[PDB]
Structures are given as structure tokens and as C-alpha cells.
Design a protein around this nucleic acid. Sequence first.
RNA 1: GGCCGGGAACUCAAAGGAGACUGCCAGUGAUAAACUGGAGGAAGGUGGGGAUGACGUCAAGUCAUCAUGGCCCUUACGACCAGGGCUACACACGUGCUACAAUGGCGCAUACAAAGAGAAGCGACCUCGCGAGAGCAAGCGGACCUCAUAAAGUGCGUCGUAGUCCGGAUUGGAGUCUGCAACUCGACUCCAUGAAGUCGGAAUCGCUAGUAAUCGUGGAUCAGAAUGCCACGGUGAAUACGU
Lengths: 127, 151, 114, 99, 100, 79
Amino acid sequence: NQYYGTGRRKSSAARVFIKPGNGKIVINQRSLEQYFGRETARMVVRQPLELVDMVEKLDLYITVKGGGISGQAGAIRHGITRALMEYDESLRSELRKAGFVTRDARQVERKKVGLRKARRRPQFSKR
Amino acid sequence: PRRRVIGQRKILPDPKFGSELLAKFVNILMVDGKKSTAESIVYSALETLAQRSGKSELEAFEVALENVRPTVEVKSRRVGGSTYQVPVEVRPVRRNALAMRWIVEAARKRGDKSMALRLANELSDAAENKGTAVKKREDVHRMAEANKAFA
Amino acid sequence: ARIAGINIPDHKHAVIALTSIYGVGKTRSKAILAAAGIAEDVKISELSEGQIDTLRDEVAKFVVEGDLRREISMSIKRLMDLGCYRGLRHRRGLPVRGQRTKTNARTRKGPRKP
Amino acid sequence: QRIRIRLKAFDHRLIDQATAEIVETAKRTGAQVRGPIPLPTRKERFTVLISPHVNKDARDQYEIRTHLRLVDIVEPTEKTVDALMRLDLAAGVDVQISL
Amino acid sequence: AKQSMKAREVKRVALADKYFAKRAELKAIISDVNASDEDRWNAVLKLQTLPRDSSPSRQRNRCRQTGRPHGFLRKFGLSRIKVREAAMRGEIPGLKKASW
Amino acid sequence: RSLKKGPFIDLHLLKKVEKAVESGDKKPLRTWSRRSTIFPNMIGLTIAVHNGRQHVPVFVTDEMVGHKLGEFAPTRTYR
RNA sequence: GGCCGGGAACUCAAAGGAGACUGCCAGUGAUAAACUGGAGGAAGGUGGGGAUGACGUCAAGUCAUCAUGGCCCUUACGACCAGGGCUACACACGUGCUACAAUGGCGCAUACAAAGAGAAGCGACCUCGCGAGAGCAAGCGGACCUCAUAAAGUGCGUCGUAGUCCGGAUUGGAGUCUGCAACUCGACUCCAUGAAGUCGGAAUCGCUAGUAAUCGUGGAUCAGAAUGCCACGGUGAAUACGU
């Protein structure tokens, strides 16, 4: 059987399928170490499994598109959390109290007329 | 502000070790949104510093900081048309912030070849109680002591 | 080492060192070294008399130093004598390629004069 | 064979009305139809100055939207093609028929 | 604008419509490679006897209601002022004030 | 300008030059055409070129070939 | 290789709907209006960003977008035509771009976006040229073709604090393209030359979170000519004790 989750961040979407046994992770047809060259990204992706002691008991099949590095890592974490909730349905309290069940609704603000950026004004002189 | 209360932002711990203090240090060192470069510099410095003293990186860092943490400082007051220096106490968060800021400012002014080398040299000298960081601490403490009458 | 009437450094790589000649840039340095058959990151200190003679022979094919200076001076003098728009600009000291002169123009005018 | 219809409009209520009409007529004449598939909307933007003289801020921003629909008919018959070609729709819907 | 400027525009458009094909032929002659090398000279000398106003690049877009040579939009054929007037009166299909 | 096109000249100027060279002696030739390249068959003549107000007389020599006619009649007054 | 047969589950597209209300719990308060905490929930107290500008002030700006009272010229202050000027240069001010370097320059080679435009238009594959480009030619009125290869980043070498392998003004020669026509007065390419400048006196400006700082991408006007204007995403901080 499969357990499914969808995750999102800045501009990225991630599809996560989880199955039981012999922990191994495939992402867009590559390995974790092949895909991410950043320790921070690796730690982010690995967090929830470390939090709930099931690191070496589940296989993960993942696809992700849109955005950059950090956005994709966050999307993946969100999706894993959703899939785990679907699988078990009793880790919800721990996951929430940790902080992985919320969607992070932080986007890029727009440019406005008369300014150089969202909030930056030109230089002002009195005389 | 005037009528506001501001909460505390969460900070992720470092990946190699698990300290938020080191994360704050990396943040204070970064420039122009380049976190990877700052992480490289910090890790290289701690690696080159662990050998010199035969102790863990966290312990070396703590020892270096404890000689630059300040306790009292001086604020400026002017209500009678004249400027007075008034001594006030510092709280632990501000202690840590000032210590890290002074360390990095002192490092940037040195004359070695690489930023990692300069940082390692400054940290070792601070552990040995020498350098511009300790000089700044001493100067601030002198200025605080000279104005005890205005407390 | 003397090449075209001047001494070239001895602790640099050949590609950088050869550029000390008035008339040799990076492209010409690469061309000359490829033609002679020497590497590009070999110091001038570890070459031999035969190699240096080869390099002199290669450099002999171009126009360098005094001849180049004579050519440039004659070119400018021709215009200055003819008296066209470009010549007048050359002999008044104001820019020649049609730039602005309400402000700036300081590489041709020098520092300000109150 | 197979018939493809593309519809464009500035008003989505109008476009939905026209699409429902076409689907009903097609189905009623004994021919299968694959339900209408929505396609991406097009947004066009403009910016103008709103003072007859100097002031350089003080602008206005306008937009025009275009809605698009696509409908497929899989096995047309002579009566079906006649019924389609003998139809009339609103005056703000653009229809293109391809065989 | 003045009344004479629009007259100039109309004259220009007429001549540019009149002389279209001749210019295309002569420019094909000059551009095409492996030509006689004397037909080229003759064609270059001949392309400068046709009237000057016949080149499409001597034309300037103007608003169709007033004649303004600045602030022109191509989708509508008008300048910014008249575009706004029509838009608020409700005479441009599909246009409305936008926010996002 | 492009080498695949040849130098540019005005037809009326070219005809006037042909006539003057074949007919020998020539007083100065008045022209408003400052965009014409100078051809080798012009040496020895006097071309009076417009500059905005008057006509400046230029006596052609052999180092001027390849230049436009306008570079020998400046347009602005400065002192 | 979503290639092929297939499936309607998932991303996603665009029409109808649900959801947040101080609605629930405890405490304070005039038996009030409210305030400081907690539960669940994607989101909590105006969730974040836009549009929306009261009676009036400054005889504020615009008779050169347009309309109009009164004045003034009609072989001329109204027409048409080629050349020049709006691009000048002892000097003074405002707004910006590039730098003064190892958190860097140079050479190799390898991940991850978003939003747009296109028939007198956008121009793939192939061949020729060191290069800007040239020749011959598919496709596309477009979730299908084209513009179109994101850059900072990561991995491996070299440079070792020098006015330099930092910076790229100015000037000499040779070219490409648009256009009847590039002297005055266009953009771009190749070879050469290699100026000022080592962080800026008295003053003085922007910013409270996906914000400042830094990296790339697109459109309008337009034959051709952005370091300006209007839009899009990637990386991502420091501090607020108080009046």
C-alpha cells in the first residue's frame, strides 16, 4: 500500500509517496546526496523522520518542481508530514507541536509605482 | 516603538553541531545573502582552531567569548542642555550580541591572507586575553567606572 | 631576459610576462607561445637560450615599440596638418568621438581650473 | 473524422452560455462529445499618466482579460455538420471550427 | 496639432502606398549577391531619384482624434488622455481598472 | 558604408564633376551635399560647401580621398 | 525517452461552492463596552498586499493634447523646400551606473524559476566567418512553434597583497547592420593603448520580514537607438531596553 502527500512552499510543489521498509529515498530519479549539495537542505528534508523514530523503516518516492533549493526542501518536508499523518493518524500532536503541520504563507511582494522596489524610495533633498 | 510588543524570531540550529549560538554567529558574519560562504569560513576557522588548543570547538568558542562579554555601559542624557554619561547594566542577550559583533569587527581589520585565518588568529588571541576586542571591553569598562557619580 | 629591446620579468608565467612589450596583448601572447611550441604556465626563469631565440624569432613578425610609436604619431600628425573636424579636436584638446562637453570630459581636460 | 471548436470571449458568463448551447445541440443529434476543457486565460496590462502636464507619478493601471474554451466532436455526421453550420450565437463570442 | 501637419501625414501615406513595389525590386537587386556589379551601381544611383516621402520611415504615429505626436498606444490608435476618457465613459470593450 | 555596397555619392554632383573634368577649367562648384564621399577624379578642383550660412571654398588635395565633404566646413562658432 | 498501448488516481488548468465570526474556555472590569491568556484549525483578533482621497487651503500647474470670452496679423505672426541647430563649454547643483579587490579575478564542467511578446512579425536544423553576422529554409495567429542557455551557486586548478592576472576613461587601425542617407550626430564586433581611484571634510538619505542588501529575466515607445520607467522570480539578515 501507498501513503500520499502534497506539499507547497514559495513556488514549489512536491508529491510524496511512502511505503514500508528499508529506508531509502529517491527524488526525481536521483539520490539525496546527488540532488542536494547543501547540508541545511539535507537536514531539513530529514527532520520529521528523525523526530518520529522511523528513520530505517520506510521507503520514500518523491517528485518536486518549481522554485529553487530552499523552497523545494521546505515543500518536501511539508509533504512528508502530511503523508505520515495519513499513514498513522496519531503523530499529529507531536508534529504540530514541533511545527511542521503549518503552511508557510510568505511570498514575494510586488513593485509599486513611484518606488524602486516594494519598500525602497528614491533619495530626497530639501533644496 | 510606542505601543507595540515584538515577539522573538525562531532560529534554526547549525547542521554540523546543534548550537543556535553558532547560527547567530554565522548570521552576523554573512554579507549580501551568501550563507554558504559564511558557513565555510566559520567551519574552517573552528577546524584550524581546535588543533591549537586540544579541545572541542564549542568549548574553545565559549572560552573566547567569556573574555569579551561586557557588564556595564554608558548612555547619553541631555535634559539640562549638557551631555552626561550614565552607567547602565547590560542583559545577557545584549552581552552575547556585543561580544560577537566586536569579535568580527576586530577580525576584519587584521592583515593575514584569508578570512578564515584572520578569524582563527583573533579567536586564539582572545582566548589568550589580547587583541582589539579585549581592548574595547577594557575601554568601555573604564568609561563606565569614571562616571559612577551619575548613577 | 631581453626580447625586443627591454627586460621582461623572470618570476612570472610566460603568457603574463610577454605582455610587457608595447604591442603584445593576451591574444598575441597566446598566439606566439602556441607558434613557438612552449607551454603557457612555464616561468621565464626555467627556459633555455634556444627557446628564447625561438621566441625572439616569433616576436620579430609584428610591429612593436619604436615603429609602432612612429606610426601612431604620423597618423595623428596627418590629421592635425590637414585641419578637419577631428584634427581641430586633437589640437584643441577636446574629445574627438562626439561625447558630451557640458559636463564631464575630464580625461581630456584635466583637473578643474577655477 | 473529428471536429474541433475554439471559442474566445471577454465575458465568461457569455462564453459558458455559448458552450452549453453547442454541447446540447451536438448531443441531441446523435454524436458523442468530449466535455469542454478550460484553457489558460490571457491578461494584458496598460499604464498611463493622468495629468496633462509635468507630474510623473500619478498613473493609472488597466487590464483586459480573454477567456478561451475548446470543444471536441469525435464522430460527426452530415446532419450534425448541417445543424452546427446553421446556428447563430451572441455578438461577443468568437468561434472557429476546424475539421 | 495644426491643420498642415495632418495634411503632411496624408500625403506621406499616399506616396508610400504608390511606390511600394519599385523599391522592393531595387533593394532586392542591391542586396542579392553575385550580381553584375554594374547593375548594382545603377540601382543605387536610381533609388535616390524617387521622392523622399515615399520611404515608410518618414512617417510618425499620431492620435486619430487630436494629432498628438507623444504618448501613443498601438492597440487603440489614441494617446493616453483620450484613452482614459473613453475608458471611464465605458467605450472600450473589456477594459477596467486593475489590481493584484 | 558596408563594404558590399560601395561608397555613396549624389547623382547631380557626379554629373557636375564629370562635366567639369572633361571641359577642363572650372571656377568653384556650389554644393549643399555634405554627405558625398570624395572620389579620386576630383583632385585639383574647388568645391564650395554649405555650412548653414555661407559657402566655404575647399581646394581638393590627394590626402582627402575617402573623407566626406562635410569634414572641411565646420558649423559652430567658438572663441 | 511519457517514446507506444493505455489510466482519470496526483501535479496543474478555470467555473460553482465551504471556511474566521471575538464563534468556544478561564481571569480582570460599572451586574457594561472592552482587555490579557488557552483549545482546536491551513490561517486569530484589520491573517498579508492593492484599488478607494471628506468640507476646504496654496489667484498652486497646464490657453503647446483638447474646448472656449476678449485682444492682435492677413502678398504675412498663414504656405512648400535643401542645409544647419536643439548634442556648444572657463564653471556651479540634483538624480544614477561602474570601481577602488582574496566573502575576490581568470580557465575548465554541473543543479534548481517566474512572469511576458509574435504576420510589413518571432526565425529553429544545416553550412560559412576568430567575431558582430551571412546563405538556404521547417514551424507558429500559439498550454503545441520561436524569442530562450537564468545568474549568484557547487567541484577541481592558478593568481599571493602588487596601482597587481584589481579598474576599463581616452585614443590609433580594420569591420557588421538598419535606413534614400550614419561628417556635424547611431548601436555592436576584432587587434592594439591601459587614465583617475588604495573606502571619500563640513553636511545628509532609505529601510521593521520574505523587508533591507545582492543575482539574473521580460514589455511599452520603436526602421535603428536604455545605466531611465513599468513588471517577474532565486539567495536572505541585524535591531526595537524606551518616549
